[PDB]
Ligand binder design. Structure first.
Ligand SMILES: Cc1cc(C)cc(NC(=O)NCCS(=O)(=O)Nc2ccc(S(N)(=O)=O)cc2)c1
Ligand SMILES: [Zn+2]
Length: 257
Protein backbone atom coordinates (compact mmCIF):
# COMPACT_ATOMS: atom_id res chain seq x y z
CA UNK A 1 0.00 0.00 0.00
CA UNK A 2 0.91 3.58 0.02
CA UNK A 3 3.68 5.38 1.70
CA UNK A 4 6.57 7.77 1.19
CA UNK A 5 9.23 5.38 -0.13
CA UNK A 6 10.76 5.01 -3.56
CA UNK A 7 8.29 2.33 -4.54
CA UNK A 8 5.06 3.47 -2.86
CA UNK A 9 5.47 7.24 -2.60
CA UNK A 10 3.59 10.23 -4.00
CA UNK A 11 4.45 9.52 -7.63
CA UNK A 12 2.69 6.14 -7.34
CA UNK A 13 -0.49 7.23 -5.54
CA UNK A 14 -2.45 8.01 -8.72
CA UNK A 15 -2.62 4.31 -9.64
CA UNK A 16 -4.87 3.48 -6.66
CA UNK A 17 -6.24 7.03 -6.21
CA UNK A 18 -6.69 8.64 -9.64
CA UNK A 19 -7.93 11.86 -8.01
CA UNK A 20 -4.21 12.42 -7.25
CA UNK A 21 -4.16 14.09 -10.68
CA UNK A 22 -7.36 16.06 -9.98
CA UNK A 23 -8.24 19.71 -10.26
CA UNK A 24 -7.91 20.75 -6.59
CA UNK A 25 -5.02 18.72 -5.13
CA UNK A 26 -2.92 19.72 -2.13
CA UNK A 27 -0.43 20.86 -1.06
CA UNK A 28 0.55 23.73 -3.36
CA UNK A 29 3.24 26.35 -3.56
CA UNK A 30 2.01 29.65 -2.15
CA UNK A 31 3.36 32.35 -4.45
CA UNK A 32 3.14 35.36 -2.17
CA UNK A 33 3.35 37.76 -5.07
CA UNK A 34 0.37 36.17 -6.88
CA UNK A 35 -1.87 35.62 -3.85
CA UNK A 36 -4.33 38.48 -3.60
CA UNK A 37 -5.54 40.24 -0.48
CA UNK A 38 -9.27 39.67 -0.09
CA UNK A 39 -10.72 42.35 2.21
CA UNK A 40 -13.98 40.40 2.50
CA UNK A 41 -12.18 37.65 4.40
CA UNK A 42 -12.91 37.72 8.06
CA UNK A 43 -10.52 37.11 10.99
CA UNK A 44 -10.22 33.46 11.86
CA UNK A 45 -11.99 32.46 15.04
CA UNK A 46 -10.06 29.70 16.84
CA UNK A 47 -12.10 28.58 19.86
CA UNK A 48 -10.08 25.87 21.58
CA UNK A 49 -10.77 26.61 25.22
CA UNK A 50 -12.93 23.56 25.81
CA UNK A 51 -10.82 21.19 23.71
CA UNK A 52 -10.73 17.57 24.94
CA UNK A 53 -7.77 15.60 23.64
CA UNK A 54 -8.07 11.86 24.12
CA UNK A 55 -5.29 9.82 22.57
CA UNK A 56 -2.18 9.90 20.40
CA UNK A 57 -1.80 7.28 17.66
CA UNK A 58 1.01 6.23 15.31
CA UNK A 59 -0.87 5.24 12.16
CA UNK A 60 2.19 4.27 10.13
CA UNK A 61 2.18 7.58 8.19
CA UNK A 62 2.35 10.17 10.97
CA UNK A 63 1.02 10.50 14.51
CA UNK A 64 -2.35 11.90 15.35
CA UNK A 65 -3.52 13.62 18.52
CA UNK A 66 -7.25 12.93 18.58
CA UNK A 67 -9.99 14.96 20.16
CA UNK A 68 -13.59 14.50 21.29
CA UNK A 69 -15.60 15.88 18.42
CA UNK A 70 -19.05 14.78 19.62
CA UNK A 71 -19.77 18.34 20.84
CA UNK A 72 -18.70 21.84 19.85
CA UNK A 73 -15.66 21.92 22.16
CA UNK A 74 -12.80 23.06 19.91
CA UNK A 75 -14.05 24.81 16.79
CA UNK A 76 -12.79 26.89 13.91
CA UNK A 77 -15.05 29.53 12.39
CA UNK A 78 -14.70 32.74 10.45
CA UNK A 79 -12.12 33.44 7.80
CA UNK A 80 -13.30 31.89 4.54
CA UNK A 81 -15.57 29.43 6.33
CA UNK A 82 -19.34 29.33 6.52
CA UNK A 83 -20.48 27.47 9.55
CA UNK A 84 -18.69 25.68 12.35
CA UNK A 85 -15.88 23.25 11.99
CA UNK A 86 -14.94 20.87 14.80
CA UNK A 87 -11.40 19.85 15.60
CA UNK A 88 -11.01 16.08 15.26
CA UNK A 89 -7.24 15.61 15.23
CA UNK A 90 -3.87 17.22 14.59
CA UNK A 91 -0.72 15.75 13.09
CA UNK A 92 2.49 16.81 11.44
CA UNK A 93 4.56 16.19 8.32
CA UNK A 94 8.33 16.51 8.66
CA UNK A 95 11.66 15.95 6.98
CA UNK A 96 14.85 13.99 7.45
CA UNK A 97 16.73 17.33 7.32
CA UNK A 98 15.81 20.80 8.59
CA UNK A 99 15.51 22.16 5.03
CA UNK A 100 12.55 19.99 4.03
CA UNK A 101 9.43 18.54 5.60
CA UNK A 102 6.58 20.92 4.93
CA UNK A 103 3.86 20.12 2.40
CA UNK A 104 2.94 23.64 1.45
CA UNK A 105 5.81 25.86 0.37
CA UNK A 106 6.04 29.65 0.36
CA UNK A 107 7.72 31.08 -2.73
CA UNK A 108 9.22 27.57 -3.10
CA UNK A 109 10.63 27.66 0.46
CA UNK A 110 10.25 24.38 2.35
CA UNK A 111 9.96 24.47 6.14
CA UNK A 112 11.24 21.77 8.51
CA UNK A 113 7.71 20.54 9.21
CA UNK A 114 4.06 21.44 8.95
CA UNK A 115 1.25 21.06 11.52
CA UNK A 116 -2.27 20.20 10.32
CA UNK A 117 -5.20 20.88 12.66
CA UNK A 118 -8.05 19.01 10.98
CA UNK A 119 -11.66 20.16 11.42
CA UNK A 120 -14.97 19.03 9.91
CA UNK A 121 -18.08 20.99 9.00
CA UNK A 122 -20.79 20.21 11.57
CA UNK A 123 -23.59 20.51 8.98
CA UNK A 124 -22.52 17.07 7.71
CA UNK A 125 -22.96 15.32 11.04
CA UNK A 126 -19.76 13.24 11.17
CA UNK A 127 -16.26 13.24 9.75
CA UNK A 128 -16.90 10.36 7.36
CA UNK A 129 -19.73 12.26 5.69
CA UNK A 130 -17.78 15.51 5.69
CA UNK A 131 -14.90 14.06 3.65
CA UNK A 132 -17.37 13.40 0.82
CA UNK A 133 -18.25 17.08 0.51
CA UNK A 134 -16.34 19.88 -1.26
CA UNK A 135 -16.65 22.05 1.87
CA UNK A 136 -16.42 19.20 4.37
CA UNK A 137 -13.10 19.96 6.04
CA UNK A 138 -11.04 22.95 7.10
CA UNK A 139 -7.38 22.20 7.76
CA UNK A 140 -5.37 24.85 9.57
CA UNK A 141 -1.74 24.51 8.47
CA UNK A 142 1.14 25.94 10.48
CA UNK A 143 4.77 25.87 9.38
CA UNK A 144 7.56 24.78 11.74
CA UNK A 145 11.08 26.18 11.53
CA UNK A 146 14.00 25.02 13.67
CA UNK A 147 15.14 27.59 16.23
CA UNK A 148 13.99 28.05 19.81
CA UNK A 149 11.92 25.32 21.44
CA UNK A 150 8.12 25.49 21.39
CA UNK A 151 7.12 24.85 25.02
CA UNK A 152 3.54 23.95 23.89
CA UNK A 153 4.92 21.03 21.88
CA UNK A 154 7.04 19.31 24.51
CA UNK A 155 4.33 17.07 25.95
CA UNK A 156 3.73 15.75 22.44
CA UNK A 157 7.48 15.13 22.05
CA UNK A 158 7.75 13.30 25.35
CA UNK A 159 5.01 10.75 24.64
CA UNK A 160 6.46 9.69 21.27
CA UNK A 161 8.57 6.95 22.88
CA UNK A 162 5.33 5.23 23.82
CA UNK A 163 4.05 5.15 20.22
CA UNK A 164 7.25 4.37 18.33
CA UNK A 165 5.68 1.94 15.85
CA UNK A 166 2.61 1.67 13.63
CA UNK A 167 -0.59 0.83 15.49
CA UNK A 168 0.55 1.98 18.93
CA UNK A 169 -1.63 4.45 20.81
CA UNK A 170 -1.38 6.11 24.19
CA UNK A 171 -3.73 8.08 26.40
CA UNK A 172 -3.19 11.78 25.77
CA UNK A 173 -5.73 13.85 27.72
CA UNK A 174 -5.75 17.51 28.71
CA UNK A 175 -3.48 18.70 25.92
CA UNK A 176 -4.02 22.31 24.92
CA UNK A 177 -3.61 22.86 21.15
CA UNK A 178 -3.50 26.64 21.70
CA UNK A 179 0.13 26.15 22.71
CA UNK A 180 0.96 25.20 19.10
CA UNK A 181 -0.25 28.49 17.51
CA UNK A 182 1.96 31.41 16.44
CA UNK A 183 1.15 34.95 17.55
CA UNK A 184 -0.52 36.07 14.32
CA UNK A 185 -3.53 34.46 12.65
CA UNK A 186 -2.82 36.08 9.26
CA UNK A 187 -3.39 33.41 6.63
CA UNK A 188 -3.63 32.29 3.02
CA UNK A 189 -6.59 30.24 1.88
CA UNK A 190 -7.49 28.04 -1.09
CA UNK A 191 -9.64 25.06 -1.96
CA UNK A 192 -7.83 21.73 -1.90
CA UNK A 193 -7.62 18.16 -0.85
CA UNK A 194 -6.34 15.73 1.71
CA UNK A 195 -2.60 15.45 1.17
CA UNK A 196 -2.57 11.68 1.66
CA UNK A 197 -4.70 8.93 0.13
CA UNK A 198 -7.59 8.95 -0.42
CA UNK A 199 -6.70 12.52 -1.56
CA UNK A 200 -10.35 13.59 -1.40
CA UNK A 201 -11.08 17.11 -2.64
CA UNK A 202 -12.91 18.18 0.48
CA UNK A 203 -10.63 20.72 2.22
CA UNK A 204 -10.69 24.47 2.67
CA UNK A 205 -7.00 25.07 3.40
CA UNK A 206 -6.11 27.88 5.79
CA UNK A 207 -2.31 28.23 6.00
CA UNK A 208 -0.88 30.63 8.57
CA UNK A 209 1.76 33.11 7.41
CA UNK A 210 3.75 33.05 10.67
CA UNK A 211 5.70 29.84 11.39
CA UNK A 212 6.25 28.52 14.88
CA UNK A 213 9.77 27.70 15.96
CA UNK A 214 10.66 24.32 17.48
CA UNK A 215 14.05 23.19 18.69
CA UNK A 216 16.41 20.84 16.91
CA UNK A 217 15.89 18.38 19.77
CA UNK A 218 12.11 18.50 19.31
CA UNK A 219 12.24 17.72 15.59
CA UNK A 220 14.92 15.05 16.15
CA UNK A 221 12.43 13.24 18.34
CA UNK A 222 9.87 13.22 15.52
CA UNK A 223 12.52 11.53 13.36
CA UNK A 224 12.93 8.65 15.82
CA UNK A 225 9.42 7.38 15.10
CA UNK A 226 8.93 4.38 12.87
CA UNK A 227 6.69 3.85 9.85
CA UNK A 228 6.68 0.08 10.51
CA UNK A 229 4.98 -2.02 13.11
CA UNK A 230 6.81 -3.58 16.03
CA UNK A 231 8.74 -6.63 14.90
CA UNK A 232 8.85 -5.51 11.24
CA UNK A 233 12.00 -4.02 9.65
CA UNK A 234 12.73 -0.60 11.13
CA UNK A 235 12.16 2.36 8.81
CA UNK A 236 12.38 5.81 10.31
CA UNK A 237 9.29 7.97 9.97
CA UNK A 238 10.83 10.89 8.09
CA UNK A 239 9.98 12.74 4.86
CA UNK A 240 6.25 11.95 5.25
CA UNK A 241 5.29 14.94 3.08
CA UNK A 242 3.68 15.17 -0.35
CA UNK A 243 5.32 17.76 -2.67
CA UNK A 244 3.50 20.72 -4.14
CA UNK A 245 0.86 19.91 -6.78
CA UNK A 246 -0.27 22.06 -9.72
CA UNK A 247 -2.46 24.99 -8.74
CA UNK A 248 -4.58 24.64 -11.91
CA UNK A 249 -7.72 26.82 -11.90
CA UNK A 250 -7.35 28.12 -8.35
CA UNK A 251 -6.57 31.42 -6.69
CA UNK A 252 -4.91 31.70 -3.31
CA UNK A 253 -6.36 34.53 -1.21
CA UNK A 254 -4.58 36.37 1.62
CA UNK A 255 -6.22 37.75 4.73
CA UNK A 256 -3.55 40.42 5.00
CA UNK A 257 -1.73 43.02 2.98
C1 LIG B 1 -12.04 7.20 14.20
C2 LIG B 1 -11.48 8.54 14.61
C3 LIG B 1 -11.91 9.33 15.68
C4 LIG B 1 -11.27 10.55 15.90
C5 LIG B 1 -11.59 11.56 16.99
C6 LIG B 1 -10.25 10.96 15.08
C7 LIG B 1 -9.84 10.15 14.05
N1 LIG B 1 -8.79 10.61 13.21
C8 LIG B 1 -9.19 10.86 11.85
O1 LIG B 1 -10.32 10.68 11.51
N2 LIG B 1 -8.09 11.34 11.06
C9 LIG B 1 -8.08 11.74 9.70
C10 LIG B 1 -6.99 10.82 9.10
S1 LIG B 1 -7.88 10.37 7.52
O2 LIG B 1 -9.09 10.98 7.05
O3 LIG B 1 -8.23 8.94 7.41
N3 LIG B 1 -7.02 11.07 6.22
C11 LIG B 1 -6.59 12.45 6.29
C12 LIG B 1 -5.67 12.61 5.33
C13 LIG B 1 -4.96 13.75 5.27
C14 LIG B 1 -5.27 14.81 6.07
S2 LIG B 1 -4.28 16.24 5.71
N4 LIG B 1 -2.66 15.78 5.62
O4 LIG B 1 -4.71 16.71 4.42
O5 LIG B 1 -4.51 17.19 6.79
C15 LIG B 1 -6.26 14.71 7.05
C16 LIG B 1 -6.92 13.47 7.19
C17 LIG B 1 -10.46 8.97 13.80
ZN1 LIG C 1 -1.56 16.47 7.01
Amino acid sequence: HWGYGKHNGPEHWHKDFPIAKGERQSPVDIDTHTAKYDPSLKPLSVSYDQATSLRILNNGHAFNVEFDDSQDKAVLKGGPLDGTYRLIQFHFHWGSLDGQGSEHTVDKKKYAAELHLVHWNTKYGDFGKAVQQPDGLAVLGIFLKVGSAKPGLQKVVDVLDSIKTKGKSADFTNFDPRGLLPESLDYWTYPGSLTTPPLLECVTWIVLKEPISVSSEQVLKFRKLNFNGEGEPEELMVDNWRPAQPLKNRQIKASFK
